[PDB]
Design an enzyme around this catalytic site. Structure first.
Site, PDB file in Angstrom:
ATOM      1  N   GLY A  26       0.839  -1.172   0.000  1.00  0.00           N
ATOM      2  CA  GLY A  26       0.000   0.000   0.000  1.00  0.00           C
ATOM      3  C   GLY A  26       0.876   1.224   0.000  1.00  0.00           C
ATOM      4  O   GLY A  26       0.561   2.239   0.611  1.00  0.00           O
ATOM      5  N   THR A  28       1.375   3.154  -2.459  1.00  0.00           N
ATOM      6  CA  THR A  28       0.782   4.261  -3.185  1.00  0.00           C
ATOM      7  C   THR A  28      -0.341   4.921  -2.418  1.00  0.00           C
ATOM      8  O   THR A  28      -0.434   6.132  -2.400  1.00  0.00           O
ATOM      9  CB  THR A  28       0.299   3.874  -4.573  1.00  0.00           C
ATOM     10  N   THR A  29      -1.197   4.129  -1.786  1.00  0.00           N
ATOM     11  CA  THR A  29      -2.276   4.702  -1.000  1.00  0.00           C
ATOM     12  C   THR A  29      -1.645   5.585   0.068  1.00  0.00           C
ATOM     13  O   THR A  29      -2.076   6.711   0.302  1.00  0.00           O
ATOM     14  CB  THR A  29      -3.164   3.611  -0.361  1.00  0.00           C
ATOM     15  N   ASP A  53       6.576   4.866 -10.165  1.00  0.00           N
ATOM     16  CA  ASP A  53       6.093   3.479 -10.196  1.00  0.00           C
ATOM     17  C   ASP A  53       5.439   3.241 -11.560  1.00  0.00           C
ATOM     18  O   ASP A  53       4.516   3.962 -11.932  1.00  0.00           O
ATOM     19  CB  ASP A  53       5.080   3.269  -9.043  1.00  0.00           C
ATOM     20  N   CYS A 269     -14.163 -14.564  11.017  1.00  0.00           N
ATOM     21  CA  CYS A 269     -13.085 -15.223  10.302  1.00  0.00           C
ATOM     22  C   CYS A 269     -11.974 -15.758  11.197  1.00  0.00           C
ATOM     23  O   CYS A 269     -11.199 -15.000  11.783  1.00  0.00           O
ATOM     24  CB  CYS A 269     -12.522 -14.303   9.224  1.00  0.00           C
ATOM     25  N   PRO A 299      -4.884   0.569   9.539  1.00  0.00           N
ATOM     26  CA  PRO A 299      -5.793  -0.571   9.423  1.00  0.00           C
ATOM     27  C   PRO A 299      -5.941  -1.065   7.998  1.00  0.00           C
ATOM     28  O   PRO A 299      -5.850  -0.289   7.053  1.00  0.00           O
ATOM     29  CB  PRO A 299      -7.127   0.005   9.905  1.00  0.00           C
ATOM     30  N   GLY A 303     -10.227  -4.807  -0.131  1.00  0.00           N
ATOM     31  CA  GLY A 303     -10.363  -4.324  -1.490  1.00  0.00           C
ATOM     32  C   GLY A 303      -9.502  -3.092  -1.679  1.00  0.00           C
ATOM     33  O   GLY A 303      -8.451  -2.965  -1.049  1.00  0.00           O
ATOM     34  N   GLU A 304      -9.947  -2.177  -2.535  1.00  0.00           N
ATOM     35  CA  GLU A 304      -9.176  -0.970  -2.812  1.00  0.00           C
ATOM     36  C   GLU A 304      -9.834   0.308  -2.303  1.00  0.00           C
ATOM     37  O   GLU A 304     -11.026   0.333  -1.996  1.00  0.00           O
ATOM     38  CB  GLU A 304      -8.865  -0.845  -4.305  1.00  0.00           C
ATOM     39  N   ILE A 305      -9.027   1.359  -2.202  1.00  0.00           N
ATOM     40  CA  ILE A 305      -9.504   2.680  -1.833  1.00  0.00           C
ATOM     41  C   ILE A 305      -9.278   3.633  -2.996  1.00  0.00           C
ATOM     42  O   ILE A 305      -8.136   3.874  -3.397  1.00  0.00           O
ATOM     43  CB  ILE A 305      -8.757   3.231  -0.617  1.00  0.00           C
TER      44      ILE A 305
HETATM   45 ZN   LIG Z   1     -11.053 -13.695   6.582  1.00  0.00          ZN
END
Ligand SMILES: [Zn+2]
Lengths: 338, 61, 341, 61
Positions: A26, A28-29, A53, A269, A299, A303-305
């Site tokens: 992450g 780049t984020t 990049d 999970c 955190p 998925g993506e932001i």
């Molecule tokens: Zn999980």
């Protein structure tokens, strides 16, 4: 030492903020988040977010099409973005050089001296990126006060800083040969031996100039990004040590994709809680290893932001450390939207 | 130019062109292609280093 | 095409040495255990030793039995023994006694050794490896029976096998040391000669030993290396490096085990959105690994979250090194092991 | 023995002892301790290399 980047984000003194990290972190984020948090805290200032990049995903991240030319972030007045390819850039400069046997020998001469020393390309390349930024300013009319650099995840972008001393030894090496030429030769050649010396001194100069800046902790700092997993952590220690050996200021570590399974309302999970157990083992380890760093624990948002709207929501936690208990709602909105 | 130098140039150039091409590819979005290229660069580097030594020795005094 | 499994290696009879290694959080040990178990099950007429030099020393946890330096049978098998050893500790103990057994004369000989040996990399690693071998032999002669194949669970850091390049450079400096001692006169050759001859001898023994090892580690029918990794850029990168390194030593490397695969599409229940997110990443690299190592046995092993412990579960899990795990049919076998935990 | 050599030995020995100790620690089960030790080894390595050069130059002919 505060577990956030608030000092950096309010810093008036910095012109250069490098953000780098190997292999899936992450990076780049984290680059974006930083750029934004500074743009908000310092509206009286202009920020350039540039990225080399080859993934070139500043555009995906923001949801807006960026390219070689700066372009203001949609919704902001003080944050611009460019994606550039430094190899491509340098390629184009050298192909121009060509068109403008004499040249063969001089080309040969240069190679012999230079094609063998590590970092020459990297520096030439960085130079061309500086120059290209300048042309963007002079066209626009404004300037940037801070650039935040989203660095390429593979390679040694900043190892050219040891170049100046090397270039010196060999300026002499070359000087002690060109001396042994006589009148006849110094006549057909001299002019181009003068050019070979020229370029070399210029490069050294430039690099030394860059060095003086990069080596000023007030003017330029490096933020490392990593995840809580042996390989990244190890890669990250390596990165620091290198950076330190370049007299470059490295003071912050963003740790991404933490699961915080304990503070979770899904608890669904066992796999996730299992992963979290490892993440936390190493997390303890970091705590007692980089005691004098700002180590910022971010955190995992699944998925993506993307979108300045989301980026900003997420970016707040570089400034005020994310507490999983209280701050959970923010992550679980973002996640549920994607 | 002797075939030895002709080839040294050629490789040295092939290598350079390959390096700049690989620098434009994303290691993560193209792990396989990227890696293959890395292998060919490391290889070219060893060939180049030989041709050099061979050229240098063959021109010594 | 090349079977996505280790059946070939599991059924092979030519192999004396199987090294298993991978850097950094990958199921290396479990993999070692599974390979050993499978080999033993498929070759009841042969005798296997699984040895681990990993400082974590978790052979014992894997099987749920206390293993130590003395080889000992896995409970529930007649042809699998395990042992855990710390080679540096062993070598240390060797040099403590060499010192005890020999003050100026010994300081000079010590120093001379240091000046030739200290700088060179891999010396301590060769000496170390040699002590492990001596140890295995003493175990065999003591137990009255020999091992057919050893399976080596290597430490996840350092360079176990980078001393295979040693003999060349030992030969170089043997002649350097020679050229110098050849210049000693009759007097000095008298007070020192014996020490000089001991030093030469010491070096030649090491060269010969290493050469003796090297001829074996270099036979693709006799020894091979299995790399262990997971489907993530950093690990894949380290895995390629390791392969390249191995190849530089002329070691045979034909197999890769890719562990901790989620297979999230093929199981709705055990996978929250976060897992499915992760599986997408893992899947991305799997496609890469595939075109990158087409002539390799690359074996795709499923994440069995929690931890595999006991001959029973290890065996249940190890079967998938032999017959490629299919996430559809074979699913219930996994989520059975998981749920027990 | 001069203080210079006295110290070179001492370090060279400190370094060795540290290396074997670190080889017995699990990098993963003890990332922090392990890492710290790696730092001290790299450091001792630089000090040792200096003391060496200094001893060698000081004994040259
Ligand atoms: Zn999980």
């Amino acid at each position: 030492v505060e577990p956030n980047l608030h000092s950096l984000i309010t810093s008036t003194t910095h012109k250069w903020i490098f953000v780098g990290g190997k292999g899936g972190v992450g990076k780049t984020t984290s680059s974006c988040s930083i750029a934004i948090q500074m743009a908000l805290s310092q509206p009286n200032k202009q920020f350039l977010l540039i990225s080399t990049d080859p993934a070139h995903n500043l555009s995906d991240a923001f949801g807006e099409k960026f390219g070689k030319d700066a372009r203001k972030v949609t919704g902001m007045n003080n944050l611009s973005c460019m994606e550039i390819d430094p190899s491509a850039a340098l390629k184009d400069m050298n192909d121009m050089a060509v068109s403008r046997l004499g040249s063969l020998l001089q080309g040969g001469a240069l190679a012999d001296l230079t094609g063998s020393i590590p970092g020459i390309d990297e520096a030439l390349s960085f130079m061309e990126v500086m120059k290209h930024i300048k042309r963007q300013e002079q066209g626009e009319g404004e300037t940037f006060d801070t650039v935040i650099f989203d660095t390429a995840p593979t390679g040694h972008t900043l190892r050219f800083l040891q170049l100046p001393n090397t270039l010196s030894k060999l300026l002499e090496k070359f000087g002690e040969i060109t001396n042994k030429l006589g009148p006849m030769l110094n006549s057909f050649m001299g002019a181009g031996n003068v050019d070979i010396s020229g370029k070399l001194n210029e490069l050294k100069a430039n690099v030394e100039t860059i060095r003086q800046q990069f080596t000023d902790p007030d003017l330029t700092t490096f933020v490392c990004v990593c995840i809580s997993e042996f390989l990244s952590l190890y890669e990250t220690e390596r990165l620091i040590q290198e950076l330190i050996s370049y007299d470059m200021d490295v003071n912050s570590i963003i740790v991404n994709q933490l699961l915080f399974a304990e503070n979770d309302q899904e608890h669904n999970c066992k796999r996730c809680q299992a992963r979290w157990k490892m993440q936390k083992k190493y997390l303890d380890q970091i705590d007692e290893l980089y005691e004098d760093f700002h180590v910022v624990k971010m955190p995992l948002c699944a998925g993506e932001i993307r979108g300045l709207n989301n980026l900003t929501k997420f970016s707040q936690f570089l400034n005020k450390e994310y507490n999983p208990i209280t701050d959970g709602k923010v992550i679980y909105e973002l996640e549920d939207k994607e | 130019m002797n075939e030895l130098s002709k080839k040294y140039l050629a490789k040295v150039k092939e290598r350079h062109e390959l390096k700049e091409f690989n620098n434009s590819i994303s290691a993560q979005d193209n792990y396989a292609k990227w890696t293959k290229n890395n292998r060919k660069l490391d290889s070219l580097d060893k060939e180049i280093n030989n041709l050099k030594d061979e050229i240098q020795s063959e021109n010594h005094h």
